[PDB]
Amino acid sequence: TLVKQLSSNFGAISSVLNDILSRLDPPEAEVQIDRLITGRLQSLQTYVT
Amino acid sequence: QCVNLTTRTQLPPAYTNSFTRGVYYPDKVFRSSVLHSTQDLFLPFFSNVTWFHAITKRFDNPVLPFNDGVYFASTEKSNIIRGWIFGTTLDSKTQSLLIVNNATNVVIKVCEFQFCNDPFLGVYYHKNNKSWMESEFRVYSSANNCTFEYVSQPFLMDLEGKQGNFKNLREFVFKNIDGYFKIYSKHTPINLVRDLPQGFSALEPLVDLPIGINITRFQTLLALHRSYLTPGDSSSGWTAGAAAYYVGYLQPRTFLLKYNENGTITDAVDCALDPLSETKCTLKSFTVEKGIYQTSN
Amino acid sequence: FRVQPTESIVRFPNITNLCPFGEVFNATRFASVYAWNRKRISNCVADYSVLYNSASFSTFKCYGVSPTKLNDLCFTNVYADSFVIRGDEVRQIAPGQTGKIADYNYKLPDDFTGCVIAWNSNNLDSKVGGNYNYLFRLFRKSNLKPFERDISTEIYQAGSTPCNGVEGFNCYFPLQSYGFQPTNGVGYQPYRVVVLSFELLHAPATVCGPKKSTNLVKNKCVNFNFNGLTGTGVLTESNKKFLPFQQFGRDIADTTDAVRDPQTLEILDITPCSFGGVSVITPGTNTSNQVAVLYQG
Amino acid sequence: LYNSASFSTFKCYGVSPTKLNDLCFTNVYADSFVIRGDEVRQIAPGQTG
Ligand SMILES: *[C@@H]1O[C@H](CO)[C@@H](O)[C@H](O)[C@H]1NC(C)=O
Ligand SMILES: *[C@@H]1O[C@H](CO)[C@@H](O)[C@H](O)[C@H]1NC(C)=O
Ligand SMILES: *[C@@H]1O[C@H](CO)[C@@H](O)[C@H](O)[C@H]1NC(C)=O
Ligand SMILES: *[C@@H]1O[C@H](CO)[C@@H](O)[C@H](O)[C@H]1NC(C)=O
Ligand SMILES: *[C@@H]1O[C@H](CO)[C@@H](O)[C@H](O)[C@H]1NC(C)=O
């Protein structure tokens, strides 16, 4: 389940970080980065608990 | 001009049951030894598939509705089935895709076609030389405007008026999504003609075309065999060979696909056919242990 | 611990065709908004250098992609939509915006991924007495779905009075002439607006950036770019068998582990470079200052 | 009133004539006068005479 949670969008345009980085400029990209960061951090917290 | 077929016997269409046939690769990705689950248009297992037969002077080219999708499977020996017409109005008022295979180049073009009431292909056996030629090509009348045309390489086949048992099984799936015409094909040798055999045969994609027209009706093209012992008229002497093709309709369904080591789809399981099938879909396994499980709400 | 990449490689298809931007932008006859024209572009290298130069371009807005990066990644099925709208309406042709023209004519999906290019037209699309060739719809029963066209010409029904041919009270034709004139203000001048839509839609890619392809190096931790796919891992020869239509590979985790080289059509595996972990052991600062380093993996 | 069709002219400016009861108004004011046949165009928004 931890590994499968890695593929979700969490609201970003794409799940893969590299696709977001290449397609979008830095100023616009960081929001899409923030979505993924929050989602993955929450998944890690759940697993640890 | 187009000759009109006459004196043809009309019979009610029979019904037969499919047996877990019609699974195709849904993507270009390669997977091995993975129980992947996908959601797309599929032919549900054990479905009610209409069965047509062509054989006194029994003939049938009904204009069947296209619906969301079509599973066209024809078992034949003499290749009496040649091509399919895909049009909405079928009266040269709207674009009508024409896929026809003949002795000449395979013709896959979209144009405004004034299709006649009976678009039947005709192959005549000549007496000057012992060869079969398509003396009749009066399927349509004219093609004023042609938006897109694609002519492939010529294909040669032995066309004869034989009533023997079918030698091969050909399966085709047609889908019209996002303006792209997708055709999946498979070719499996077969000898039994009673019904479709059991088993799973994955269909590999054949070709994709950007026709970009919406289709509501389609019609199959059946060749007519006229030998030197027959007058060759549409009234008499037009007796065609034995023909059997099955038409099924796709629906939105969820399948669980099994890939072996080489990447081929050996088996599949529906997720709405039975409670046991739903349980196997939930657990993502083909075997279920003793116990009690919660499938849905 | 980490292993750092040494070199970078790019593997793009070898395409010599150049996409005809001339027809798209510099067209003598330019379509109307009521019936917008769609052009399909494929199998050509697209140079977007001219686009960000902004030569005589009033508005250059890109959604979902950055114009500077447009000549890097690689796409499929470039669409071009041409239509003519009034000078104060170019703003409303944008994702998530509703307006009189947008609801009753060409509209953009909320998930649009493309660039909107607009430039002003002074008198090329204007007449001294008013250009009435261009038409727009101000009436419609139901708002259009994304990427829809209307060819119907019927009188709109208002109230209980029948319309669509029964002309009378509360019967107005939805189509109206724009009436462009060179004497009007800047906000009433016709503007030529072209919409580009970009989608991958499959593994194969047709329109690719003018970036040169370098040689191939194997068995070294390097940066690889296959048809716009960016990653970092060692590249080795692969024994995995791909069916001819298949182009990529995926594992259980769904990350790419194999890919086909576009130039040479050779299957090669991808393996991530080793990272591991570092642990340092000490007999104690009091006893000595020597340490031993353990690498986990 | 819209379906009555007893009015030679039934034009709504700034609001949809078909959907008028749907929208509530804080205050409604009515002005009444009878003019000639060549003066209806004069009584219109953006019209001067
Ligand atoms: C298919 O439907 C027909 C009625 O349309 C029915 O008579 C027939 O039994 C059905 N097929 C099967 C295998 O039950
Ligand atoms: C074929 O296209 C031309 C060009 O617009 C058109 O004038 C003609 O009417 C079309 N033919 C038919 C049968 O509509
Ligand atoms: C399909 O084509 C027919 C042609 O008569 C048209 O009436 C219908 O609106 C079309 N449907 C869609 C969804 O475009
Ligand atoms: C994969 O292909 C090889 C070579 O044809 C064959 O030996 C092997 O049995 C196949 N594996 C399957 C079909 O699972
Ligand atoms: C180191 O060991 C000696 C001997 O016991 C002791 O006197 C000294 O305080 C120790 N120093 C530290 C930093 O542990």
Short mmCIF file of N, CA and C and ligand atoms in Angstrom, two decimals, chain B residues 88-89 94 213-216, chain C residues 145 148-149 151, ligand 3:
data_model
loop_
_atom_site.label_atom_id
_atom_site.label_comp_id
_atom_site.label_asym_id
_atom_site.label_seq_id
_atom_site.Cartn_x
_atom_site.Cartn_y
_atom_site.Cartn_z
N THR B 88 -23.29 6.82 -41.41
CA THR B 88 -24.44 7.23 -40.61
C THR B 88 -25.71 7.31 -41.45
N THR B 89 -25.67 8.09 -42.54
CA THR B 89 -26.83 8.26 -43.41
C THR B 89 -26.81 7.34 -44.62
N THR B 94 -23.54 12.21 -45.96
CA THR B 94 -22.57 12.26 -44.88
C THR B 94 -21.45 11.27 -45.18
N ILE B 213 -15.25 10.72 -37.84
CA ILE B 213 -16.67 10.80 -38.15
C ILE B 213 -17.42 9.90 -37.18
N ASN B 214 -18.63 10.31 -36.80
CA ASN B 214 -19.43 9.50 -35.89
C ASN B 214 -20.33 8.55 -36.69
N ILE B 215 -20.37 7.29 -36.26
CA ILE B 215 -21.02 6.22 -37.01
C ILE B 215 -22.12 5.64 -36.15
N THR B 216 -23.30 5.45 -36.75
CA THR B 216 -24.43 4.83 -36.05
C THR B 216 -24.90 3.53 -36.68
N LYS C 145 -20.95 21.35 -25.56
CA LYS C 145 -19.91 20.58 -24.90
C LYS C 145 -18.56 20.97 -25.48
N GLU C 148 -17.09 21.28 -29.74
CA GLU C 148 -18.28 20.96 -30.51
C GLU C 148 -18.51 21.99 -31.60
N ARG C 149 -19.21 21.58 -32.65
CA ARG C 149 -19.54 22.46 -33.77
C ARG C 149 -21.04 22.39 -34.03
N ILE C 151 -23.88 23.18 -37.13
CA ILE C 151 -24.15 23.46 -38.53
C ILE C 151 -25.62 23.76 -38.78
C1 LIG E 3 -23.85 11.64 -35.06
O1 LIG E 3 -24.11 11.94 -36.44
C2 LIG E 3 -25.48 12.29 -36.69
C3 LIG E 3 -25.62 12.50 -38.18
O2 LIG E 3 -26.99 12.57 -38.57
C4 LIG E 3 -25.87 13.53 -35.88
O3 LIG E 3 -27.25 13.80 -36.06
C5 LIG E 3 -25.57 13.32 -34.40
O4 LIG E 3 -25.79 14.52 -33.68
C6 LIG E 3 -24.13 12.87 -34.21
N1 LIG E 3 -23.85 12.60 -32.81
C7 LIG E 3 -22.82 13.15 -32.15
C8 LIG E 3 -22.68 12.77 -30.71
O5 LIG E 3 -22.04 13.92 -32.70
#
